[PDB]
Write a protein that binds this ligand. Structure first.
Ligand SMILES: C=CC1=C(C)[C@@H](Cc2[nH]c(/C=C3N=C(/C=C4\NC(=O)[C@H](C)[C@H]4CC)C(C)=C\3CCC(=O)O)c(CCC(=O)O)c2C)NC1=O
Ligand SMILES: C=CC1=C(C)[C@@H](Cc2[nH]c(/C=C3N=C(/C=C4\NC(=O)[C@H](C)[C@H]4CC)C(C)=C\3CCC(=O)O)c(CCC(=O)O)c2C)NC1=O
Ligand SMILES: C=CC1=C(C)[C@@H](Cc2[nH]c(/C=C3N=C(/C=C4\NC(=O)[C@H](C)[C@H]4CC)C(C)=C\3CCC(=O)O)c(CCC(=O)O)c2C)NC1=O
Ligand SMILES: C=CC1=C(C)[C@@H](Cc2[nH]c(/C=C3N=C(/C=C4\NC(=O)[C@H](C)[C@H]4CC)C(C)=C\3CCC(=O)O)c(CCC(=O)O)c2C)NC1=O
Ligand SMILES: C=CC1=C(C)[C@@H](Cc2[nH]c(/C=C3N=C(/C=C4\NC(=O)[C@H](C)[C@H]4CC)C(C)=C\3CCC(=O)O)c(CCC(=O)O)c2C)NC1=O
Ligand SMILES: C=CC1=C(C)[C@@H](Cc2[nH]c(/C=C3N=C(/C=C4\NC(=O)[C@H](C)[C@H]4CC)C(C)=C\3CCC(=O)O)c(CCC(=O)O)c2C)NC1=O
Ligand SMILES: C=CC1=C(C)[C@@H](Cc2[nH]c(/C=C3N=C(/C=C4\NC(=O)[C@H](C)[C@H]4CC)C(C)=C\3CCC(=O)O)c(CCC(=O)O)c2C)NC1=O
Ligand SMILES: C=CC1=C(C)[C@@H](Cc2[nH]c(/C=C3N=C(/C=C4\NC(=O)[C@H](C)[C@H]4CC)C(C)=C\3CCC(=O)O)c(CCC(=O)O)c2C)NC1=O
Ligand SMILES: C=CC1=C(C)[C@@H](Cc2[nH]c(/C=C3N=C(/C=C4\NC(=O)[C@H](C)[C@H]4CC)C(C)=C\3CCC(=O)O)c(CCC(=O)O)c2C)NC1=O
Ligand SMILES: C=CC1=C(C)[C@@H](Cc2[nH]c(/C=C3N=C(/C=C4\NC(=O)[C@H](C)[C@H]4CC)C(C)=C\3CCC(=O)O)c(CCC(=O)O)c2C)NC1=O
Ligand SMILES: C=CC1=C(C)[C@@H](Cc2[nH]c(/C=C3N=C(/C=C4\NC(=O)[C@H](C)[C@H]4CC)C(C)=C\3CCC(=O)O)c(CCC(=O)O)c2C)NC1=O
Ligand SMILES: C=CC1=C(C)[C@@H](Cc2[nH]c(/C=C3N=C(/C=C4\NC(=O)[C@H](C)[C@H]4CC)C(C)=C\3CCC(=O)O)c(CCC(=O)O)c2C)NC1=O
Ligand SMILES: C=CC1=C(C)[C@@H](Cc2[nH]c(/C=C3N=C(/C=C4\NC(=O)[C@H](C)[C@H]4CC)C(C)=C\3CCC(=O)O)c(CCC(=O)O)c2C)NC1=O
Ligand SMILES: CCC1=C(C)[C@@H](CC2=N/C(=C\c3[nH]c(C[C@@H]4NC(=O)C(C)=C4CC)c(C)c3CCC(=O)O)C(CCC(=O)O)=C2C)NC1=O
Lengths: 177, 238, 164, 164, 164, 164, 177
């Protein structure tokens, strides 16, 4: 809904002053690794199905209290609902990733959300466990640091790109809490 | 059969039933709409229910935007046109609940009567999204989820399809936005008499029309009726 | 806010789809236009005030009737309010000049242009005649070349397009 | 069409109610104003052309810039198109002056005033400055009295109100 | 509430339009009526009880079966509840007689007449036969003339119209 | 049909806005990827049949149970119907490989994958195990480099993503 | 709704065969003048307001039979409706122009349209007159061949680009007829 270009421009309306020639040089540093970001986020959609398949299986294995009756992921409809509530996180954080800007979160998903989860009795610790899985899924996937997934990209640094996505799931775990 | 009057390739809509029945159908649908408009204004006042506009332009731009939407129904493919006739029969039988042996065989002979009936019945039975008022912050979220789900009919696999074309000038874009929250403000505006009954009207509408079962999720509707009002699962492609 | 990313990630949003290799290719054109499309910002970061004061009196030259009574720009304080009004205009042009869209225009420049010149009797003809006079001041001499000078025109022109 | 009867019988229509002694009392005020509210029609049935030609050049007097190039009323044929444009305006004022509403205005005068002066660059300020100059020509001398002269003002003024 | 003003300002409300010279002419007919349409209030401000007790036993005369067992008006206390029930009716007629509508009727007289005589077995035929017998008691002798006496008829008659 | 232009002009369509300098920048990335994103079409315009026959028996190698009775690929004619089924798959991959989207996939490849393998008992696991074995056959030797070879992967992978 | 890239791909599904290395070379000829097309269609949105202002004024001057009572553009609401019916043509043909492909016409505007115009009694000859104005507006605007409008672009040929847009208004005049 808002991006990294116009992230500074609402701040530039906040002074009611002209944009410089200097303040937009941060956009150049953002802009040189744009092809790096596109070498990254394709790997974010590389095995996103395997990512979430990994995520809820790796969340349920330390906590099979949800498979107990009354546990939130006992019912297979509740399990698919858990998959549905999970896959939009993979949507929304990567919308913010290609934005270079965390704007799609707070207007599409974060508001009214933990209120529903306490209205539905959804255990929040299971969701922060699942999203913390994702935070290390993503930085492993943007690199070639996976067990069998070798998404070979043009060599060099994506720690800028890793710090970008690590600056995204934190707000996810924060707003659901 | 060379040079036959009949043509293999053209475009029927289905449901044609002869030329004289087309003047029949729109007029039956017209007086059904007048019967619906004799309810919320239905004592002598024109409540903020109908709310044609809000300013200078918002009067006559809502005219041509609605006429545009009526045109977008006309220029559809025979696939979705046939499909719309097909869902219209099965939804118009789910209107009064009773199989009125005359008034069921209207709505399976006829469709814009049926479509107009479903719309005008959803307007007087204030079960709509433009009359919802979610108090809970949990309710607004799930209302949003249902709204996003609806776009899947409009956007089947990734493109917007002219079914939310919403007005076609530079100006016709911006007027729909202000006409939205003009009426969306009027959802919380009317009275305590009405809009407490809307919470029960969606409780009359969503629980039985579209979801016969799903009791664990029908209890969501009885939990959150404002999200159950904005479900809008009649396929108006909107 | 109308950047290319605001289009394409909201496209996949209202899709509900994955951010696949549909949306990836959108940004690199804006990235390659960081060599061109935002280099027309510094030329009026050198000329902030030095273009609106020579456009506004030109508007007052073709419209000398403004300084009469019964008008908008009657006395000098309305002339100052003219000189800040067009300042806001090419200010927002220089704003949209670095975003990848006309988001600052489409929220703050031309959206809501309906009654602000209708009820306040301001001629939008005079506004576009002021800002079109700013348009032919683009040339490869003393600006940079038409790799970068043309995006200024490409952003003031939509201001003409929805003002006029 | 905005007469008092168009209000009250459509009120009972969208009511679906009987035409009871709610709607009956509405017409007799218009009936009593047939002594007053439509007697301001004959004063410009004597002065058809003789008011718009003295209002339009007054508009051209306060706005002499119109006859420049780059304007609307540049040459004399656009001056004739000015002189018929205001003719249409107080024509429709004399129309709504006999209906019990501004129905001819609300369908044909001011509805759709949005882009016809925006895209065609016509100053609606110049239109209301022309027709407000017609307003102070109402006086009990050489018209009839303010029993009937005031409804002219009461119908041109809404034309100001939605034009300006 | 169904006055002429409740129609016309809600018309401009659901229009969202300005309160132009569409809605202005609506009130003066009711104003001119104030000489006629509400002058039929004082004639039963002199005859409060003196018309319902002579209408109700007339209803009991044409319907003598009411005083049987298995009916509504069996004994004298149901006769008193009859005599207050029609009192409420022409009470509300005298109410709508001063409003410019049948608002007190359309909220309190005839709206919700569906089951209150269906489940309680009250013959609405007996109600309209009682109140139609009140109707021919209008005459220019000992009332005022048909300038004002007719609005009584014009307000009891809609009570017939939705009761019967 | 899911090209970048099908996104951006339908965006301005459902906007109703002008085709401004919002939608202009969208196409030139696809234009620059005409050097890269559609150059992976000729490598299986040389290998039409020569990749599906070596993927399908590999699927039959990891799934040898298919040739049993009570299965889908029991006898050799169902093996031919396997060999055309995956042919349709990477056929449509080579289709979406030249469009700027997965429009041929999103209408014809993976839309409606719900019951065609559910009622017909076809393992979509076997389909993705066949077509993932086609994926590691991308290498800079004997293809062109990863400027162009990667879009093949980028189009078969969404077929995995909605098949599996 | 469909573009010039996928224009050949529905034809390539029509054979159920692979796309070649040769059939997509027409896309290269389409692709070299892409920056030419963007040097063109900005001039199509150069004075599009003046273009339509020119169009209905230049249509009404040979036929002021619409200014007669009962004529279709007598009423100023009918005149603005004529402007509205006209400006979407400038939208739709340039959607097809940037598409390089005539697909946005037949699904958004052309169907059901002359049926409305005969349902509304709209004179079709006035509309073909207005759109034939546009057909010569556009080729004049993509070049510098205007009276005062000098949209100076990078020099050379746009007759490929002129034949593109001339291959667009023809279907507009055809489908409204
Ligand atoms: C509690 C139960 C439990 C599990 C179900 C598994 C699941 C699991 N995997 C990883 C860890 C990871 N998971 C992935 C994701 C994937 N790796 C791939 O090879 C596929 C492409 C893709 C889908 C499976 C990646 C890339 C890593 C980091 C490095 C790696 O292991 O590959 C993590 C830690 C989160 C992280 O570091 O990102 C967890 C919890 N482990 C567990 O402890
Ligand atoms: C729209 C589709 C699209 C793509 C798929 C990419 C494709 C792509 N990636 C890179 C280029 C790159 N990509 C990466 C990213 C990585 N390298 C690694 O070793 C890690 C595995 C990973 C971290 C995420 C790096 C480090 C470069 C080199 C850029 C540089 O070093 O400055 C380049 C070179 C141009 C440049 O970076 O300036 C291109 C064209 N770009 C696109 O426009
Ligand atoms: C030309 C025909 C035609 C119709 C009658 C209506 C359909 C219709 N029926 C009702 C009204 C009704 N409709 C029914 C339905 C039925 N009654 C029965 O006893 C049957 C079992 C069943 C089919 C006739 C009932 C019981 C009511 C009264 C209660 C209600 O308002 O629902 C209403 C609301 C208005 C009102 O309350 O009267 C409408 C619009 N539309 C049409 O086009
Ligand atoms: C007394 C009866 C009565 C009605 C039924 C409504 C009918 C109605 N709806 C709308 C206008 C609207 N009406 C709806 C309502 C709906 N759209 C749908 O697809 C659903 C079927 C339904 C509720 C979810 C919406 C969403 C709009 C705005 C966009 C549109 O016109 O579709 C308008 C234009 C004026 C306005 O409301 O802004 C009117 C007259 N008004 C009335 O006076
Ligand atoms: C509309 C957008 C949208 C969201 C913002 C999220 C949020 C969200 N979750 C649920 C609803 C839910 N979300 C979950 C998911 C979970 N519960 C847990 O304990 C785990 C942490 C996690 C799975 C890993 C469950 C179990 C339900 C309730 C389903 C049920 O119990 O039947 C709902 C109600 C209906 C719906 O599913 O839409 C919404 C809006 N999901 C969405 O669809
Ligand atoms: C906020 C309120 C709210 C609800 C009440 C439910 C209602 C609901 N569930 C589904 C979604 C579904 N609905 C069903 C239908 C049913 N499932 C069953 O267990 C029963 C057999 C039957 C009960 C009606 C099925 C099987 C699905 C999953 C597949 C599908 O999307 O159709 C859909 C279609 C849109 C979608 O989710 O994809 C709707 C409207 N969802 C909501 O968001
Ligand atoms: C954020 C973006 C932004 C803008 C686009 C402008 C828009 C703008 N202009 C004016 C206000 C004004 N603008 C003008 C300017 C002119 N009048 C004319 O007739 C000439 C065409 C032109 C001078 C050449 C004048 C004279 C006023 C004051 C008149 C008035 O509005 O009362 C105002 C209200 C303040 C006031 O009333 O004084 C605003 C919001 N301001 C902004 O903050
Ligand atoms: C039924 C009601 C009715 C009206 C209200 C008018 C409204 C109206 N005016 C014009 C048209 C015009 N109106 C004017 C008038 C003026 N321009 C100015 O700048 C001054 C303010 C004013 C002179 C004092 C001019 C000069 C034109 C022609 C300019 C143009 O529209 O191209 C046109 C289109 C005809 C044309 O383009 O020539 C219409 C419909 N005509 C009607 O039929
Ligand atoms: C504000 C407006 C207003 C009204 C219009 C009346 C309407 C009205 N009538 C009755 C109630 C009654 N009304 C009658 C009258 C009659 N029964 C007949 O069969 C005859 C036709 C008629 C006598 C001639 C009787 C006998 C009862 C009591 C019977 C009952 O309702 O149980 C009641 C309930 C009180 C009760 O049950 O006793 C009400 C609300 N009262 C009001 O307050
Ligand atoms: C336009 C796109 C397009 C496609 C994607 C395919 C999809 C497709 N496959 C089959 C049909 C089939 N597809 C297979 C293939 C297999 N079965 C398996 O269990 C294995 C996983 C795999 C072989 C390796 C078989 C064996 C049939 C015939 C079985 C059947 O459908 O009755 C059919 C119906 C025809 C038939 O019934 O024979 C269709 C439409 N065809 C198309 O035209
Ligand atoms: C009958 C009365 C009558 C008029 C009102 C004028 C209007 C007019 N101009 C042109 C002709 C044209 N009109 C334009 C449009 C424009 N040219 C510009 O300089 C502006 C940017 C833009 C808005 C005015 C262009 C580009 C041409 C062709 C070459 C030219 O004259 O510039 C044409 C012929 C149509 C065509 O060739 O395209 C007409 C009828 N001429 C008349 O005969
Ligand atoms: C929704 C998308 C859309 C279209 C596909 C076109 C087509 C179209 N035209 C009109 C409706 C019209 N279109 C015109 C236009 C003209 N008549 C003529 O004789 C001239 C040739 C031409 C002007 C130059 C007129 C005059 C009307 C009727 C307006 C009226 O008479 O009040 C309508 C009905 C309501 C509306 O305006 O939307 C539609 C859908 N216009 C659109 O808005
Ligand atoms: C997104 C924004 C965007 C633009 C505004 C343009 C800007 C632009 N135009 C051209 C380049 C050009 N543009 C034109 C077009 C024309 N030349 C004329 O003399 C006529 C006036 C006009 C006919 C329409 C021609 C002929 C070239 C040179 C290309 C060539 O000759 O091969 C080039 C050179 C690159 C190339 O063409 O290969 C660039 C960057 N490109 C963009 O990407
Ligand atoms: C088919 C696309 C279309 C419409 C819908 C209407 C929309 C509409 N209603 C109006 C104005 C308006 N609104 C109402 C009340 C309104 N009327 C009712 O029957 C009910 C139930 C109402 C509550 C909202 C009345 C009585 C009028 C005046 C007569 C009229 O225009 O209908 C006005 C203009 C303001 C004015 O007339 O002064 C418009 C544009 N017009 C269109 O072009």
């Amino acid at each position: 809904m808002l991006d990294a270009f116009s992230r500074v421009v609402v701040n530039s309306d906040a002074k009611a002053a002209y944009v410089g020639g200097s303040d937009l040089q941060a956009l150049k540093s953002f802009i040189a690794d744009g092809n790096k970001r596109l070498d990254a986020v394709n790997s974010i959609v590389s095995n996103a199905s395997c990512m979430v398949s990994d995520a809820v299986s790796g969340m349920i294995c330390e906590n099979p209290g949800l498979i107990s009756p009354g546990g939130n992921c006992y019912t297979n409809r509740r399990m698919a609902a858990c998959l549905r509530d999970g896959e939009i996180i993979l949507r929304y954080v990567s919308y913010a990733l290609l934005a270079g800007d965390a704007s799609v979160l707070e207007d599409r998903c974060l508001n009214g959300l933990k209120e529903t989860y306490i209205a539905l009795g959804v255990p929040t610790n299971s969701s922060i466990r699942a999203v913390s899985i994702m935070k290390a899924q993503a930085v492993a996937f943007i690199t070639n640091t996976a067990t069998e997934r070798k998404m070979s990209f043009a060599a060099g640094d994506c720690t800028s790109l890793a710090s970008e996505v690590a600056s995204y799931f934190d707000r996810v775990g924060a707003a659901i809490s | 059969k060379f040079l036959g009057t009949l043509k293999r390739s053209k475009d029927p809509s289905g449901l044609r039933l002869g030329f004289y029945g087309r003047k029949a159908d729109d007029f039956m649908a017209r007086s059904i709409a007048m019967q619906a408009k004799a309810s919320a204004a239905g004592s002598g006042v024109y409540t903020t229910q109908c709310s044609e506009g809000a300013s200078k332009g918002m009067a006559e731009n809502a005219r041509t935007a609605s006429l545009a939407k009526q045109f977008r129904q006309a220029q559809r493919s025979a696939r979705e046109m046939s499909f719309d006739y097909y869902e219209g029969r099965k939804y118009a039988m789910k209107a009064v609940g009773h199989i009125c042996n005359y008034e069921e065989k209207i709505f399976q002979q006829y469709n814009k009567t049926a479509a107009a009936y479903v719309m005008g019945k959803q307007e007087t039975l204030l079960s709509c999204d433009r009359y919802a008022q979610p108090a809970n912050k949990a309710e607004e979220y799930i209302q949003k989820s249902v709204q996003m789900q609806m776009k899947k009919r409009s956007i089947p696999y990734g493109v917007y399809t002219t079914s939310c074309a919403d007005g076609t000038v530079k100006g016709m874009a911006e007027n729909a936005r202000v006409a939205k929250e003009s009426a969306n403000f009027r959802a919380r505006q009317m009275s305590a008499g009405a809009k407490a009954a809307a919470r029960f009207n969606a409780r009359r509408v969503a629980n039985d029309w579209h979801n016969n079962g799903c009791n664990y999720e029908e209890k969501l509707t009885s939990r959150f009726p404002a999200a159950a009002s904005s479900v809008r699962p009649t396929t108006n492609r909107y | 806010m109308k950047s290319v990313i605001t289009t394409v990630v909201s496209a996949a949003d209202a899709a509900g789809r994955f951010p696949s290799n549909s949306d990836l290719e959108s940004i690199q054109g804006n990235i390659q236009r960081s060599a061109a499309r935002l280099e027309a910002a510094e030329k009026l970061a050198g000329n902030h005030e030095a273009v609106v004061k020579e456009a506004g009196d030109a508007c007052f030259a073709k419209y000398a009737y403004l300084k009469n009574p019964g008008e908008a720009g009657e006395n000098q304080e309305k002339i100052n309010k003219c000189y800040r009004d067009v300042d806001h205009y090419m200010r927002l042009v220089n704003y949209c000049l670095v975003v990848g869209g006309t988001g600052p225009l489409d929220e703050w420049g031309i959206a809501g242009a309906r009654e602000v010149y209708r009820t306040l009797n301001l001629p939008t003809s005079a506004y576009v005649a002021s800002i079109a006079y700013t348009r032919d001041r683009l040339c490869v001499p003393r600006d940079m070349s038409a790799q970068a000078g043309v995006e200024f025109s490409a952003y003031l022109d939509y201001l003409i397009n929805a003002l006029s």
